[PDB]
Every structure is written in structure tokens, then in C-alpha cells.
């Protein structure tokens, strides 16, 4: 080899070491993804976490655990051609608004927004790419649901409803429906915390869920599953 | 008496262990190292350690029936002796290192795993086999046959000279035996106990809820941490225990009546310890779903 | 009778 | 809106109509002719023995 | 009155179908028969390139046939020296979501862009010595699927929604925009002369665009599923498209229909990429089945199998001079077959 | 743009020691290997040091092998050259030269200004010509020779061409053999084979006047030529 060749291979070696150090510093950052209808407080949650831009990334940390958060709400493209990029995501944060069981936005003759989010959740949970990725399900308007169930019962949205018109029973019904939407119960789990304008709770739940999922992943990778 | 049971029983043990280890090693070798999740390289190391553990048995098979008469040459004895040394204790320390890595990875992944990239690549196996070689160094070539009486029947025993003062020889055998047993009896024991107890404590304080769906997970995982350590202990402990007892028996009186039973069951205790290497595939690989 | 020194280190063991 | 979109589709189709079309035989024969003419310098079909291959 | 217009459009489409049916004289298989078969093309990996850490989504070959640009989900845009496996550059990107990468014919600029719906232009030969951003093109309302250079100033970007744009680099403006696809346009191949380019969308249609004018001269619809990759022939007479329906179809511009179809029973996966070897005997198609198949373009037969990858062979490419084909996959590998 | 201003030097007793320092100015200093070239008061150019990108290779010369130490620090973008024992043959004006090495690279792009230090086998290039008189405009050829052929097995020859205008710092004319550089007009050209390499210039002006040097880049003890002075009678 010539002198230029030795210098070139030294440059390649230093570039390789820089790439390795960048990868090792990036592999310790928890990656998360958000999905929602669009009016489900996803922007509100993003603003709370902090305390035409198709992809939006937000950095935040809590208890010495860096968190990568990606928002894909403003994409307006068919989901199949770009949903496989997010295969190694630690968890998926699904924000669904429990308040707007009624009040369809797209077409009055069509189904409710709860139902559209239900199909979205089913498609994401049963997707072949996310066969091993947990979902941290969220309900957004705790108080709005409480003040709207009094005037209108849960029967206006579901025909098979049979429970009483109380807050806890309706919350349990919606939670159980979103739980039983899942089809591979063993591989993945749903966390379904309730948050509405509450501080120190959203990030705490995200941290606990991330620690649990990383522990379970470590057990799976360490021949103990 | 009843000396005809041992040849056949370790024949069967060899057959079962060789079949299981081959089935495991073909699968682990057919896959590339990079695609392996965390410790399949260590698992393949354990498999090849068991292979080196077993392959010295065919030459040792008809040894009992030829009644301590070795015509094959002392050099082969010198080879296979450090071979069996290295494979047995390096296998114990391989189990030790694997369980320590699991302890580090699960107990506190957030605080730990800074050194995981350094440890998991090749340094753990490198230092493990370096320690194995270092422990083999005093007994690399230390085998000389024993004439015993005027009878021509002799076999390749290990070197009894270690030329020094008369009292220094006894010290040499006792020290080498005690050290060789003690390292792999006490360091792996503490490693197993501490690491597995910490894993159990971490899962107990981590789940925080006894969910019915997760109840099966909790129960079978706790059972895994129970069974791994209990099998390792209840299998490999008695051999070291009885050998240490007999070595200590030189100081004590211990009339020949008891030593008769002790040295009659020590050949049995060899296989009573070998069962761990025999059945560890069912312990580690067979439970893991993706081997199947 | 008297136990031989063979099984101490030879018959099976690898000490 | 919709009416304009349908109209534009109509003019697009009518412009697609006025396209000179040659027979499949002639175009295919041209493809074979070009392919066979350039098929002597292609390295994938005929590997370079020792020199011109830098890999 | 939309019914009258719709039925007129249907009648005109029927006229087009009748015309293309009448133009079909004889099958390409019959005419191509009596030719010498390719034979068992043996392909062996000359040398592999390693250093990435995520899945490689796009690669592009330089016009010198020695330099290679690779893009990955890790925020790295490595420029490779194919002959000696040396990393010439390591370009960090603002967004780690990369779906396409291009290398300028002059060898000065490199463009990458993905879900961040903006195309980033990088200057390689910089006076300072580090790679700098030249222009951050924005204005597409969707993920960029394929960006390609006509020259040092013009770049064509395959949008995410329905469109394509003839961006010029000097000013952040679109000289002309292309509309007419009913789905997400994914592939974009340029002719040997930068006067026409064909694009495929997720609606089973391929459209031949006139770059200077800005109209779709011809439309091609033979497939039944999404179109992933399109590559021109060594000349501008024909081109081949790969779909998710386990098929590759060779379309002809002059005759204006499909010439020959490339499908086999054993293949049930999709076509991740497609490229023509020089002189156009061989059609190299990437597959979801973790393998690359060497298709004879003239006769629908499988010359060989390029099987040296673990995961999806996402990106494929043949050098302009024609020595070697480089395949990238979802593992952090990129092997140079020859 | 890129500005290298080396500084530090006065009178030195015959045997003392002093330190040279060159400060970079915003051109990604850490990614460039840096050289050290000195010029005798009325003679050609030598080569005294080389530190690579990342302080990997620290090749020295055969005459300053033990008495010279070169080091760099990534912060503050400064290059150092520390002397320990200065002889009478070390008096010169020292040039800090940038060098970047990859496939499509141009070594020896930017040269420094220089610091006056007044103390008070290897391939040899001949450059037998010492002065070729030239007109206001004509075609002029500058020749060179090498002891060993510079055509490596890779396929590229490693002879470079430099121009030193009266009262300025050297620049780069053809950054390899027959490979035109950047910032230099199309008049200059090169062509050579074997051990004989030549330079050609199409049209003259008040910018080609100066002294032209050659340089090989095969073996790290780099050598220059005697120089060819153009006087423009």
C-alpha cells in the first residue's frame, strides 16, 4: 500500500470508531411512538411531557433514562409503506379520547370517533411488524367523560351495553374492550392508564411501563422466557 | 463389589449426553454470532465444554474391564487428564459467568449495561479460558505410572514425585487438590446463590401485582430460578464433598471399614456429579422456546 | 482385607 | 372541484389517445438487436478473467 | 352532468384498450425463442461492507463505479470505497428516518430524505473539509420515497402523497410539478438521457413523464398490487416494474403494453428492488424472501440465485460501467456481488 | 476563509531550544493531518514532521528525528513543533501545511505564511533545469525525474506540483500527476509516465512567474525538487 493508502485506512478506522461510539450512545435511548385520531390530546400530552413536519421528535429525560418520542400524526399517507421503519420501538403510546364517544367528526352517517380509534388500535396491535411491541394505552379526558355521562348514557354508542351509568363501570367497559381487542396476549401487554391535566403522573407511568417492558425484553433475550 | 454397574451406567450417560449436546451444538453453530440475542455464544461455549467433557469417555470406557492396565501410553493419560480437568471446572465457571451476566443484565439494566458492550463481545470467554489454562498450568504434564508391587499390572497414575523434601510432597498433593476443588466449589456456589436470589428479589419487587394472566409467568419463572440452582448444587456438590472428606481423612483416624464404603461410592459419586453435565441441556436450552 | 491405593487416584478420579 | 377533476381526466385520456403505436414485433426485435449488439462487453454474462475485474 | 363525462371517459378508455389489443402482433416469448440461454450465472460475494448499525434503506452507485453511498435508519450516511472497503465520509443527518439516497453524477452532491418530508442536499467537496448542508428542500406534504439527480442543479423527488417535483437546487422552488397518480408514488427511474422518467405509485400504475414539458405521455397498468421499484432498460425503449404480487413486468414505451411477465410459483413474497444488468440480458430483482433472483430479461427464466443475505434485500444496484452489483439488506450489511 | 497563521520565533543561541505554534481558523481542524515544511533562506524545501488525524502516525525526518517533537490538541485548534537542540542548518522559515487523505482527496491544499527562525534510500528528484527564460506569453514546459518509478500498483502516480510566487506561500497547481487542482486556471496541465514527469503551461501572465517544485508521496520521508525559476525577460 502507498502512504495515501495507509492514511485512507486510518481515516476509515477513525470513522468506524466514531460510528461505533455514536451507536453505543444511541442504543441506550428509549424510543417511543404515538398514535391517535388527531383530536385526542396527543398534542396536549406532548406539551405535558415537555414540562410540513411529517415526523416530529421530542427529547426528554426522567430518572436518568433518555426518552425518544416520535409523533406520526401529521403524515396523511397510507400507513403500510412507512410503518415498518418503527420495528425496534420500545413501546407504542396510543392516545384515545374516551370523552368523544358521540359527536362524530368525519361523517354523521358513519360510525363514531371511538369506533374509528378502535379499528386503528386493532390494526396497530395485530400488525405483523408490532408482534413484540407493547402499547401504553392512554385515555385523555377523564373529567369530560364524567360530566358527559350524566346527561347521556353509554348506551347511545354501544348496543350491547348492559352495565349501570356510573363512571367506574363505563371506564371499566371501555378499558376491557380495548384490552380484548388484542389477539396475541402472551407476547404483548396493554397498560391503559387514565390521565387528564395531571402532572407528575403521565411521565411516572411512562417510566414505569418502559422499565417493565425493558425488563421483560431482557428476560426474553437472556434465555429466561 | 457390584463393579459391573458403573461401566454400563456411564455408557448410557455418555450416550444421552452426547446426543443432547450434539442436537444443541448443531443448532447453535448453524446460526451466526451477530444475530444471537445476548448470550448464545456463551451457550455454544457451554455446549463445546460438555463435548470436551464427554469425548474422553470412549477411551476410558473399557478401563474397568481391563482392570487398571494401560497399554495405550502414559501420554494419552496426560492429555485426557488435563482435558477432563479443564472441561469440568471451566464448565462450572462458564455457568458462573453466564449467570453473572444475567444478574447484571436483569437486576438493574438502567444503571448497569455500561460495561455490557465490553463484556459480552469476547473478553468474558477470553478471561474464562485464560483462567482455565492458568489452573491447568500446574497439572499440564503431571502423570507418572505407579509400579506398586512386583505385579506387572500398572496404570498411568499422576506424578507423585514433585521432587522436594519428604514433607513437601504431602503438602503438594493436598494443596493442589484442595485448591482445585475449592475454586469451583465455592466461587460458583456464591455466584449462583447471590445472583439468583437477587434476580428473585428484583422480580418480586418489580411486578408489584399478582395478575392472574401474569400468575403463570411469575410461577414458572420463579420455578426456573429454583430449579437451575438446585440442580447445579444437588448434582455437582457431592463429588467435591466426598473428595474433600477423603483428603481430610488422612489426618483423622477413620478406620478402614468406613473408608471401604467411601472409596466404593466415590466412583459412583463421579457419575452422581456427572449427571449435571448430562441433564443441563434440558435445564437451559430445552426450556428456551426458540431452540425448538 | 486391606484396601489398595489404586482407587484413591486411579480407578476413576481426576483430582 | 370534482367536475374540474373529471374534465381534466377527460383531456388526459384524450391526449393519451393520440399516441403513435408501433407493433410489438418491431419493438421486441429492436430490444433483441440492441441487447445482442451490446452483449459482448457485459461483465455479468461473461466474467473478466483476471485483469479488468477490480473486485 | 358528471355521468355523461364519466361515460365518455369510459368509452375513451375502451378505445385505448382496443387500440393496444390491436397493436399486439405476436408474443415476445415466441420471437425471443431460438436464442441461446444465459446458463447458470454463478454469483459470489467479492467483498462485504460493514459499519452501519440499522437497516439499510437505500444505496446509490456513483458514475465512477467506485464510490457508493448508503443510507440507514441510524442517522448515518456512509460513502463507501467499493474497491478497498474504506469509509470516505460519515454524514450525520438531522432526521434518522431515511428512505432514499442519491449520488450526483458529478460526484459533488448527495441527497437523502425520508419521513421528515424534506430533501437534504450535502456538499462533499467542501473548501472547509466537512460535509455541509447546501439546500434543505421543503414543500412535499409526505415522505420522500425516491430522489434522483438530473444534474448538479435539478433534482426529481418522488413525493409521498401523489406527486413528483422537478426541484432546482439554486433556489428553493419547484420548476414543475407532476400530478395524476392516485396513490403514494414510491419508485422513480430516469432514462439514459434526462428527458423522461417513469414513476410507480401504490395504485398499480406507471406513468412516463416528460421532464421538459410536464405531462404524462403514456400510462401503464398491468399489475394488480402496489409498485415498489422501477428501473429503465439500458436504453429508453422499455422498463421493468416490481410489485408486491410476486411479479416483475417488462413494459415497452413504443408499443405501449406489457411485453413479458416474470413470476414463479415458488415466489410468494414482494419485489423490494429491481435493476438491469448492462446490455440487458439479466434482470436483477430483490425479494422479500431474503434473496435476489437473476432473471433473464429476454426469456422468463431464472438464471441464478443471489442468496447471501439474512433479511429483506431492500436496496439493489448495478454499476454504470457494469463490473459488480451491490445489494443492501435490513441487517447492517451491504455486499458487492460480482 | 481557511487561514493558518503560525507564529513564534526570534534569535536562538547555537544550541538552545524554542517552540513553534500554528493556529487554525474554522476549517474542521480535527479531521486534517498536518505537516511541517521549512525553507532555507536561498534553497529549496525540506520536510520535518507529520502528525495524522487523531495523532496516530507521527513520522519525522531523518535529520530532525530525535530533536523534534510534533503534537496537536483538538481544542483551540493549534499545532505544535517543539525543538530541543538547534544546529546551524535548522535556520529556515517554517510552513504549516494542511493535508486530507481519502480517495478523491487533494493533499497539500492550504499552506501557512511562515515563521523566520534564525539560529545565527530516499527517492531523489533531479529537476536539472535551473532557469528557463520566458516571454509575456508562450508555451513553457517544466520537466522532472525520479529515482524510483512512482506508478504504484493502484494505478496513480504521486508527483505533485507547487508554485511559490516571489514573496508569498506555496500553492498547489496539479494535485496529482495530470490531475488539475482547484482554484488554479485551465492553462496549467501535466502529463508523464515511468520516471519522467513534465508540466506544461499554455498562456503566460503575471501569475506564472515564480519557482516551481515537485514532490513525491510514495515514501513518507518526502522530498522536493531544486526548483525552476522563471524570470520573464
Amino acid at each position: 500500500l502507498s502512504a495515501e493508502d495507509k492514511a485512507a485506512v486510518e481515516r476509515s478506522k477513525m470513522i468506524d470508531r466514531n460510528l461505533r461510539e455514536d451507536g453505543e450512545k444511541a442504543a441506550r435511548e428509549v424510543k417511543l411512538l404515538l398514535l391517535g385520531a388527531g383530536e385526542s390530546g396527543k398534542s396536549t400530552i406532548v406539551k405535558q411531557m415537555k414540562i410540513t413536519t411529517g415526523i416530529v421528535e421530542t427529547h426528554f429525560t426522567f430518572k436518568d433514562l433518555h426518552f425518544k418520542m416520535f409523533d406520526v400524526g401529521g403524515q396523511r399517507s397510507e400507513r403500510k409503506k412507512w410503518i415498518h421503519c418503527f420495528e425496534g420501538v420500545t413501546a407504542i403510546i396510543f392516545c384515545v379520547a374516551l370523552s368523544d364517544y358521540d359527536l362524530v367528526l368525519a361523517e354523521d352517517e358513519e360510525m363514531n370517533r371511538m369506533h374509528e380509534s378502535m379499528k386503528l388500535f386493532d390494526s396497530i396491535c395485530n400488525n405483523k411488524w408490532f408482534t413484540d411491541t407493547s402499547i401504553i394505552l392512554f385515555l385523555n379526558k377523564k373529567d369530560l367523560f364524567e360530566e358527559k355521562i350524566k346527561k347521556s348514557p353509554l348506551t347511545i354508542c354501544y348496543p350491547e351495553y348492559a352495565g349501570s351509568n356510573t363512571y367506574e363501570e363505563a371506564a371499566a367497559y371501555i378499558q376491557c374492550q380495548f384490552e380484548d381487542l388484542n389477539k396475541r396476549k402472551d407476547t404483548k401487554e396493554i397498560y391503559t392508564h387514565f390521565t387528564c391535566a395531571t402532572d407528575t403522573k403521565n411521565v411516572q407511568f411512562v417510566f414505569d411501563a418502559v422499565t417493565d417492558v425493558i425488563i421483560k425484553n431482557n428476560l426474553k433475550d437472556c434465555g429466561l422466557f | 463389589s457390584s463393579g459391573a454397574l458403573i461401566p454400563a451406567i456411564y455408557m448410557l450417560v455418555f450416550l444421552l449426553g452426547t446426543t443432547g449436546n450434539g442436537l444443541v451444538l448443531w443448532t447453535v453453530f448453524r446460526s451466526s454470532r451477530e444475530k444471537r440475542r445476548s448470550a448464545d455464544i456463551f451457550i455454544a461455549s457451554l455446549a463445546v465444554a460438555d463435548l470436551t467433557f464427554v469425548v474422553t469417555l470412549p477411551l476410558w470406557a473399557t478401563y474397568t474391564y481391563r482392570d487398571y492396565d494401560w497399554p495405550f501410553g502414559t501420554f494419552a493419560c496426560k492429555l485426557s487428564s488435563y482435558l477432563i480437568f479443564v472441561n469440568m471446572y471451566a464448565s462450572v465457571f462458564c455457568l458462573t459467568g453466564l449467570s453473572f451476566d444475567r444478574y447484571l443484565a436483569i437486576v438493574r439494566p438502567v444503571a448497569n449495561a455500561r460495561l455490557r458492550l465490553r463484556v459480552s463481545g469476547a473478553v468474558a470467554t477470553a478471561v474464562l479460558w485464560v483462567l482455565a489454562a492458568l489452573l491447568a498450568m500446574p497439572v499440564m504434564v503431571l502423570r507418572t505410572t505407579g509400579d506398586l508391587e512386583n505385579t506387572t499390572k500398572v496404570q498411568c497414575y499422576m506424578d507423585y514425585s514433585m521432587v522436594a523434601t519428604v514433607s513437601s510432597e504431602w503438602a503438594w498433593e493436598v494443596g493442589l487438590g484442595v485448591s482445585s476443588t475449592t475454586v469451583g466449589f465455592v466461587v460458583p456456589f456464591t455466584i449462583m446463590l447471590t445472583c439468583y436470589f437477587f434476580i428473585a428479589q428484583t422480580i418480586a419487587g418489580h411486578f408489584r401485582k399478582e395478575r392472574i394472566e401474569g400468575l403463570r409467568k411469575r410461577r414458572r419463572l420463579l420455578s426456573i430460578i429454583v430449579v437451575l440452582v438446585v440442580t447445579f448444587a444437588l448434582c455437582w456438590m457431592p463429588y467435591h464433598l466426598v473428595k474433600t472428606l477423603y483428603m481430610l481423612g488422612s489426618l483423622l483416624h477413620w478406620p478402614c471399614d468406613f473408608d471401604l464404603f467411601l472409596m466404593n461410592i466415590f466412583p459412583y459419586c463421579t457419575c452422581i456429579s456427572y449427571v449435571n453435565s448430562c441433564l443441563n441441556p434440558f435445564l437451559y436450552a430445552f426450556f428456551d422456546p426458540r431452540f425448538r | 482385607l486391606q484396601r489398595r491405593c489404586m482407587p484413591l487416584h486411579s480407578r476413576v478420579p481426576f483430582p | 372541484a370534482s367536475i374540474a377533476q373529471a374534465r381534466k381526466l377527460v383531456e388526459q385520456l384524450k391526449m393519451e389517445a393520440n399516441i403513435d403505436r408501433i407493433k410489438v414485433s418491431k419493438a421486441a426485435a429492436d430490444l433483441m438487436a440492441y441487447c445482442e449488439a451490446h452483449a459482448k462487453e457485459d461483465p455479468l454474462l461473461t466474467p473478466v478473467p483476471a485483469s479488468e475485474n477490480p473486485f | 352532468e358528471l355521468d355523461q363525462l364519466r361515460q365518455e371517459a369510459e368509452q375513451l378508455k375502451n378505445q385505448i384498450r382496443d387500440a393496444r389489443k390491436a397493436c399486439a402482433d405476436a408474443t415476445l416469448s415466441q420471437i425471443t425463442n431460438n436464442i441461446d440461454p444465459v446458463g447458470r450465472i454463478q454469483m459470489r460475494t467479492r467483498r462485504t461492507l460493514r459499519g452501519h448499525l440499522a437497516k439499510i434503506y437505500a444505496m446509490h452507485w456513483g458514475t465512477d463505479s467506485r464510490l457508493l453511498v448508503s443510507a440507514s435508519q441510524d442517522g448515518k450516511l456512509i460513502i463507501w470505497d467499493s474497491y478497498t472497503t474504506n469509509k470516505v465520509h460519515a454524514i450525520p443527518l438531522r432526521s434518522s428516518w431515511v428512505m432514499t439516497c442519491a449520488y450526483a453524477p458529478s460526484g459533488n452532491y448527495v441527497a437523502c430524505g425520508g419521513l421528515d418530508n424534506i430533501c437534504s442536499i450535502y456538499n462533499l467537496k467542501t473548501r472547509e473539509g466537512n460535509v455541509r448542508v447546501s439546500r434543505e428542500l421543503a414543500g412535499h406534504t409526505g415522505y420522500l420515497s425516491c430522489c434522483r439527480f438530473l444534474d448538479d442543479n435539478q433534482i426529481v423527488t418522488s413525493s409521498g402523497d401523489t406527486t413528483c417535483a422537478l426541484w432546482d437546487i439554486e433556489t428553493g422552488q419547484q420548476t414543475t410539478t407532476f400530478t395524476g397518480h392516485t396513490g403514494d408514488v414510491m419508485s422513480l427511474s430516469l432514462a439514459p438521457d434526462t428527458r423522461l422518467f417513469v414513476s410507480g405509485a401504490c395504485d398499480a400504475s406507471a406513468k412516463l413523464w416528460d421532464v421538459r414539458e410536464g405531462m404524462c405521455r403514456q400510462t401503464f397498468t398491468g399489475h394488480e398490487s402496489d409498485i415498489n421499484a422501477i428501473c429503465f432498460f439500458p436504453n429508453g425503449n422499455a422498463f421493468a416494474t416490481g410489485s408486491d404480487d410476486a411479479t416483475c413486468r417488462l413494459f415497452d414505451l413504443r408499443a405501449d403494453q406489457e411485453l413479458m411477465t416474470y413470476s414463479h410459483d415458488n415466489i410468494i413474497c414482494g419485489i423490494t428492488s429491481v435493476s438491469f444488468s448492462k446490455s440487458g440480458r439479466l434482470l436483477l430483482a430483490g425479494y422479500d424472501d431474503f434473496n435476489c433472483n437473476v432473471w433473464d430479461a429476454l426469456k422468463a427464466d431464472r438464471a441464478g440465485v443471489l442468496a447471501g443475505h439474512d433479511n429483506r434485500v431492500s436496496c439493489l444496484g448495478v454499476t454504470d460501467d457494469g463490473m459488480a452489483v451491490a445489494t443492501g439488506s435490513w441487517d447492517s450489511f451491504l455486499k458487492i456481488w460480482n | 476563509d481557511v487561514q493558518l497563521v503560525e507564529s513564534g520565533g526570534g534569535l536562538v543561541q547555537p544550541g538552545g531550544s524554542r517552540k513553534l505554534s500554528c493556529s487554525a481558523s474554522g476549517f474542521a481542524f480535527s479531521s486534517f493531518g498536518m505537516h511541517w515544511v521549512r525553507q532555507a533562506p536561498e534553497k529549496g524545501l525540506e520536510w520535518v514532521a507529520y502528525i495524522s488525524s487523531g495523532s496516530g502516525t507521527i513520522y519525522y525526518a531523518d535529520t530532525v528525528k530525535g530533536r523534534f517533537t510534533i503534537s496537536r490538541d483538538d481544542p483551540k485548534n493549534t499545532l505544535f513543533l517543539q525543538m530541543t537542540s538547534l544546529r546551524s542548518e535548522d535556520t529556515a522559515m517554517y510552513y504549516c501545511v494542511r493535508s486530507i487523505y481519502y480517495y478523491g482527496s487533494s493533499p497539500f491544499d492550504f499552506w501557512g505564511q511562515g515563521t523566520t527562525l534564525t539560529v545565527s534510500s530516499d527517492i531523489v528528484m533531479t529537476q536539472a533545469t535551473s532557469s528557463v527564460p520566458v516571454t509575456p506569453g508562450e508555451s513553457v514546459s517544466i520537466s522532472c525525474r525520479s529515482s524510483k518509478s512512482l506508478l504504484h500498483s493502484n494505478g496513480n502516480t504521486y508527483l505533485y506540483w507547487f508554485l511559490q510566487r516571489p514573496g508569498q506561500s506555496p500553492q498547489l497547481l496539479i494535485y496529482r500527476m495530470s490531475n488539475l487542482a482547484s482554484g488554479v486556471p485551465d492553462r496549467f496541465s501535466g502529463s508523464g509516465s515511468g520516471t519522467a514527469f513534465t508540466l506544461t503551461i499554455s498562456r503566460l501572465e503575471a501569475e506564472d512567474v515564480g519557482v516551481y517544485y515537485c514532490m513525491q508521496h510514495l515514501e513518507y520521508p518526502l522530498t522536493f525538487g531544486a526548483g525552476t525559476k522563471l524570470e520573464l525577460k
Side-chain angles (χ1 to χ4, degrees), chain E residues 112-183:
Chain E
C112 57
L115 278 82
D116 57 353
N117 64 7
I118 62 170
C119 198
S120 305
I121 290 280
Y122 292 100
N123 187 10
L124 304 192
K125 300 190 184 63
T126 60
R127 179 66 178 86
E128 290 84 20
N130 76 28
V131 165
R132 310 204 96 261
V133 179
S134 294
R135 276 279 153 190
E136 204 80 31
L137 311 173
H140 275 297
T141 56
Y143 69 112
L144 278 75
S145 301
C146 204
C147 64
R148 290 290 178 265
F149 282 75
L150 269 67
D151 51 353
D152 266 12
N153 189 359
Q154 302 197 326
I155 190 167
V156 179
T157 49
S158 173
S159 87
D161 53 338
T162 55
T163 55
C164 294
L166 183 63
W167 281 97
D168 71 2
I169 300 300
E170 282 184 357
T171 53
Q173 270 80 59
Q174 327 192 347
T175 303
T176 185
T177 185
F178 308 100
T179 77
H181 269 304
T182 57

Side-chain angles (χ1 to χ4, degrees), chain E residues 58-60 62 67-71 77-80 89 91 93-94 98 100-113 119-125 131-136 147 149 151-152 155 169:
Chain E
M59 61 79 71
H60 206 84
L67 280 194
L68 198 55
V69 56
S70 57
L77 200 77
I78 294 306
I79 297 169
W80 294 93
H89 292 110
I91 297 169
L93 316 181
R94 275 78 62 203
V98 192
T100 187
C101 73
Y103 182 76
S106 72
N108 290 318
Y109 308 95
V110 174
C112 57
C119 198
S120 305
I121 290 280
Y122 292 100
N123 187 10
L124 304 192
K125 300 190 184 63
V131 165
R132 310 204 96 261
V133 179
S134 294
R135 276 279 153 190
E136 204 80 31
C147 64
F149 282 75
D151 51 353
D152 266 12
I155 190 167
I169 300 300

Side-chain angles (χ1 to χ4, degrees), chain B residues 39-266:
Chain B
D40 292 330
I41 183 64
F42 292 165
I43 296 169
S45 302
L46 182 63
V48 67
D50 193 16
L51 181 64
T52 55
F53 180 89
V54 297
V55 298
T56 185
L57 195 144
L59 196 58
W60 182 65
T62 176
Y63 174 65
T64 300
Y65 284 98
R66 61 172 47 114
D67 181 0
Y68 324 125
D69 189 9
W70 187 263
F72 285 89
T74 312
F75 189 85
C77 320
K78 306 167 67 179
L79 191 81
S80 48
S81 48
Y82 79 87
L83 186 60
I84 190 167
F85 291 166
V86 159
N87 61 47
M88 67 96 75
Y89 66 87
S91 61
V92 193
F93 293 102
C94 182
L95 187 84
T96 289
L98 176 53
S99 180
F100 182 76
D101 197 7
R102 293 180 181 177
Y103 161 83
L104 186 65
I106 296 89
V107 159
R108 200 51 183 176
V110 175
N112 306 335
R114 303 287 89 93
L115 313 167
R116 175 192 297 180
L117 59 90
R118 302 174 180 85
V119 168
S120 60
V123 70
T125 306
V127 304
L128 200 64
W129 281 83
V130 163
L131 284 176
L134 285 178
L135 296 183
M137 294 298 102
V139 63
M140 294 299 291
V141 286
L142 203 64
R143 291 84 183 160
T144 64
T145 188
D147 298 359
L148 294 174
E149 304 171 343
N150 51 359
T151 75
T152 302
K153 278 76 65 178
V154 291
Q155 193 273 350
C156 46
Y157 315 149
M158 293 180 183
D159 195 5
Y160 281 157
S161 70
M162 69 287 292
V163 175
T165 69
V166 186
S167 71
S168 195
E169 170 182 352
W170 175 300
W172 257 98
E173 289 90 6
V174 302
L176 69 91
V178 171
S179 59
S180 59
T181 62
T182 300
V183 292
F185 187 62
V186 76
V187 172
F189 185 82
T190 60
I191 285 298
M192 295 298 102
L193 178 58
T194 53
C195 292
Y196 282 167
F197 187 79
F198 273 139
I199 286 299
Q201 276 195 329
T202 46
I203 177 159
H206 173 268
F207 267 54
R208 208 199 60 85
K209 185 59 183 62
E210 318 278 6
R211 298 184 301 179
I212 52 170
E213 292 86 14
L215 261 177
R216 301 299 181 271
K217 173 74 172 184
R218 179 67 180 271
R219 291 176 188 170
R220 60 88 173 174
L221 198 149
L222 179 56
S223 180
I224 297 155
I225 296 89
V226 167
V227 296
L228 262 63
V229 63
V230 69
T231 59
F232 167 53
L234 269 297
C235 289
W236 261 116
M237 183 177 176
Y239 168 82
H240 293 259
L241 176 60
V242 65
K243 198 158 84 181
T244 314
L245 287 174
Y246 183 48
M247 295 298 102
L248 294 179
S250 64
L251 295 173
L252 286 184
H253 287 269
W254 290 8
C256 300
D257 197 6
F258 301 93
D259 291 5
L260 191 141
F261 278 99
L262 260 67
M263 295 298 102
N264 185 37
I265 66 171
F266 182 76

